[PDB]
Design a protein around this ligand. Structure first.
Ligand code: SF4
Ligand code: SF4
Ligand code: FCO
Ligand SMILES: [Fe+2]
Ligand code: NI
Ligand SMILES: [S]
Lengths: 483, 283
């Protein structure tokens, strides 16, 4: 029986952005945790006073891994504020631009950020040095498959960005989404180019990525037994499948305390007691949000605000979306669950709440969601009409408001804009890693990842590898969390 | 290169960045990023991709920095915020002491062979320094100069840069150093920088004067909707006339598109980006 050790990790690496984690370990388990987002830029104040159309470029610079998500939320908010009626073909083109980056981001996350948690890379920087007891369990053959797939995935993720750029202009930071739709009508020739690249990505996802996650997972079965946290999830909806605004690839919902509930955005409030913002701004819904930095405020430990849904601390991301929507599992997931785990499952929730809401369950959910996105993209390639207009050109309003809701690869994203005198009067962002990587609220309730760290095993304080392994399962992007 | 060749040590520090300058580099076609990492440079510290973490990663960088004092390359991605005693960007913690971006640049900057300011944020301040900001976001060259640090700086701007500008500037420097040694080589690099610190092979030509729609501009034939690809994009907000980059020729993402064909140029490589290039969607 051992006493307490307190472990600080700054920087947490193989995530995006600036994160410090501090955990209290007692008797071999984490018993408390604090997450600190350590870098601030202040997009919500930078945007004030600008032509509202500029937002769909400015906001993308919140994050170079997920800029299409912010582009999408921004143009949806501007569409609403301006009363722009996006043409059907533009809705589909937007889905093709953004869906290709889901593929990029999930592949980047599993291979280039997460896989070194389980795979020893070649004997040169940036793969060494590392912890002397890194708990790397794979056979020589399977470790080599992980390295070979890491290298192949560098090419695949690059091809995904070619897909984004075909109708998006370039990537990172697309030019092709604006208020009113998409700036470039897909041609027959460029649709051939997108489909040819998509086939290569599909083959990698089906043959290498989904199988390797289950196979590595089968060597780390203990990692399905930890990291549950609150077992509470949020989805705000994403990828509209018609022009009504009512039907989406991912439908909205909340899950908490074992129960499905509807999503009502008026129940979102952002708290700041433990965040470096002025105390008088605590507890605001985003339509009345304020961003007043207070970097010297006593007791605070993060630039991430603390969003709560009707008082609840929720997580977001692939697990959240796949749990809320409960799609059928991939054929190869069904097979490997049976062969390698003895599990008979048809739909995602057949994993059960405990295994789904776990360190390894979040990696599985992300791989399953990547497979799910393949079928969506295939459908959009059949639905799109070469040559049909994708944009309208709306006048800027003097006075208006709008909200854009979508799902970034890491989770729920909304942007709210208020226009006065034809300029941005307020712009408020509530992002995915905000929901995951936030600090305590004004009542002392932990953020989702803080809570998911409780119970994580640390059997060797000198090689505390599972702390950051848990964090990485959530695919943190701290640029998004803080903005 | 070879797995067995000489590869200089590189530390990549992120200040007020978005990681887009790392992601763009991952998109390099020729050489591939795998070949860059395994055959061209030794990327000893990079928070997004390195194996180790926390104080151990910081100390690894410090050990390499001591062994290669005066010889390592320091890449900076993002601006450096000076307000609130540096507290708007903390990059690590060691010995129970937090390390701000200000602290880190003062520590490693003096001992680098050269500092590569990658991206418009690092080169010129960029979006974090734009109107409405309050963090004291500062460009690398200005921060170093204000602090008496004389190490050479090369700016490789863009939001994000093209991978070819980043890899190509590294190759330019390594070629010069092979021919002339470190100080003679860096002197030859400085000779090919413009007044804004940008290498002229990539930034020495104007977009508009080389644009395929220039005949339409001269005729006054202007697109009124983004999806009209015949007309010039000037009335839609194109900033090509004020922008020095080779995008018209190398294009983006394996040559599949570029900003002017797809929508408009927003002037992302220029020192006044974003405010001097805004509003983006009118002239
Ligand atoms: S499209 Fe832009 S760069 Fe090309 S001619 Fe017109 S204004 Fe100049
Ligand atoms: S075309 Fe203009 S906005 Fe696009 S990358 Fe080149 S300089 Fe930047
Ligand atoms: N994905 C992504 Fe970025 C984050 N977190 C956003 O939104
Ligand atoms: Fe926000
Ligand atoms: Ni992001
Ligand atoms: S994204």
């Amino acid at each position: 029986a051992t006493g307490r050790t307190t472990i600080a990790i700054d920087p947490v690496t193989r995530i995006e952005g600036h994160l410090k984690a501090e955990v209290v370990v007692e008797n071999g388990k984490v018993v408390d945790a604090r997450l600190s987002g350590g870098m601030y830029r202040g997009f919500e104040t930078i945007l004030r006073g600008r032509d509202p159309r500029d937002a769909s470029q400015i906001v993308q610079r919140i994050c170079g891994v997920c800029p299409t998500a912010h582009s999408t939320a921004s143009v949806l908010a501007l569409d609403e504020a301006f009363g722009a009626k996006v043409p059907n073909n533009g809705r589909i083109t937007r889905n093709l631009i953004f869906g290709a980056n889901y593929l990029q981001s999930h592949i980047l996350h599993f291979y280039h950020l997460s896989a070194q948690d389980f795979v020893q890379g070649p004997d040169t920087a940036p793969f060494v040095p590392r912890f002397p007891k890194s708990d790397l369990r794979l056979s020589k053959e399977l470790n080599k498959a992980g390295v070979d797939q890491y290298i192949e995935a560098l090419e695949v993720r690059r091809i995904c960005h070619e897909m984004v750029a075909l109708f998006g202009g370039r990537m990172p930071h697309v030019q092709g989404q604006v208020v009113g739709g998409a700036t470039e009508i897909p041609t027959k020739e460029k649709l051939v180019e997108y489909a040819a690249r998509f086939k290569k990505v599909r083959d990698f996802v089906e043959q290498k990525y989904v199988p390797v996650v289950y196979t590595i997972g089968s060597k780390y079965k203990d990692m399905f037994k930890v990291g549950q946290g609150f077992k509470a999830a949020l989805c705000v909806g994403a990828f509209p499948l018609d022009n009504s605004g009512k039907k989406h690839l991912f439908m909205p919902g909340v899950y908490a305390k074992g129960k499905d509930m509807p999503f009502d955005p008026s129940k979102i409030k952002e708290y700041v007691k433990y965040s470096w913002f002025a105390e008088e701004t605590t507890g605001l819904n985003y339509k009345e949000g304020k961003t007043i930095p207070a970097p010297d405020k006593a007791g605070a430990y993060s630039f991430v605000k603390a969003p709560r849904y009707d008082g609840l601390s929720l997580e977001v991301g692939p697990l959240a979306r796949m749990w809320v929507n409960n799609p059928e599992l991939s054929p190869v997931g069904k097979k490997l669950l049976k062969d390698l785990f003895g599990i008979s499952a048809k739909k995602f929730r057949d994993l059960g709440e405990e295994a789904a809401f776990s360190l390894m369950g979040r990696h599985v959910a992300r791989a399953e969601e990547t497979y799910y996105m393949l079928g969506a993209i295939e459908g959009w390639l059949k639905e799109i009409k070469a040559g049909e207009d994708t944009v309208v050109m709306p006048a800027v309003p003097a006075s208006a408001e709008g909200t854009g809701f979508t799902e970034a690869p890491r989770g729920s994203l909304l942007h709210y804009v208020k226009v006065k005198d034809s300029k941005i009067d307020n712009y408020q962002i509530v992002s995915a890693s905000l929901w995951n990587c936030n600090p305590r609220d004004d009542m002392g309730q932990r953020g989702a990842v803080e809570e998911a760290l409780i119970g994580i095993p640390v059997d060797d304080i000198q090689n505390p590898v599972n702390v950051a392994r848990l964090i990485r399962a959530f695919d943190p992007c701290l640029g998004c969390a803080v903005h | 290169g070879t797995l067995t060749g000489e590869r200089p040590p590189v530390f990549w520090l992120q200040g007020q960045g978005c990681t887009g300058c790392s992601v763009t580099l991952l998109n390099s076609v020729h050489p591939s990023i795998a070949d860059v990492l395994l055959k061209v440079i030794s990327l000893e510290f990079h928070p997004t991709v390195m194996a180790w973490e926390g104080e151990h990663a910081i100390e690894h960088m410090r050990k390499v920095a001591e062994k290669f004092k005066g010889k390592f390359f320091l890449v900076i991605e993002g601006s450096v915020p000076v307000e609130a005693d540096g507290k708007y960007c903390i990059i690590g913690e060691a010995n129970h002491h937090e390390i701000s971006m200000v602290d880190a640049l003062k520590e490693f900057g003096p001992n680098a062979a050269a500092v590569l300011a990658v991206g418009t944020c690092a080169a010129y301040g960029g979006i974090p320094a734009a109107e409405g900001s309050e963090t004291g976001a500062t460009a690398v060259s200005k921060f170093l100069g204000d602090n008496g640090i004389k190490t050479p700086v090369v700016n490789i701007p863009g939001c994000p840069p093209h991978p070819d500008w980043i890899v190509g500037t590294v190759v330019l420097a390594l070629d010069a150093i092979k021919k002339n040694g470190l100080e003679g080589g860096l002197a030859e690099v400085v000779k090919v920088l413009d007044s804004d610190g940008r290498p002229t092979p990539f930034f020495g030509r104007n977009i508009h004067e080389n644009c395929p729609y220039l005949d339409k501009y001269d005729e006054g034939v202007m697109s009124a909707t983004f999806t009209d690809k015949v007309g010039c994009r000037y009335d839609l907000g194109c900033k090509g006339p004020m922008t020095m980059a080779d995008c018209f020729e190398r294009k983006w993402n394996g040559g599949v598109n570029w900003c002017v064909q797809n929508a408009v140029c927003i002037g992302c490589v220029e020192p006044d980006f974003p405010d001097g290039k805004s509003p983006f969607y009118q002239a």
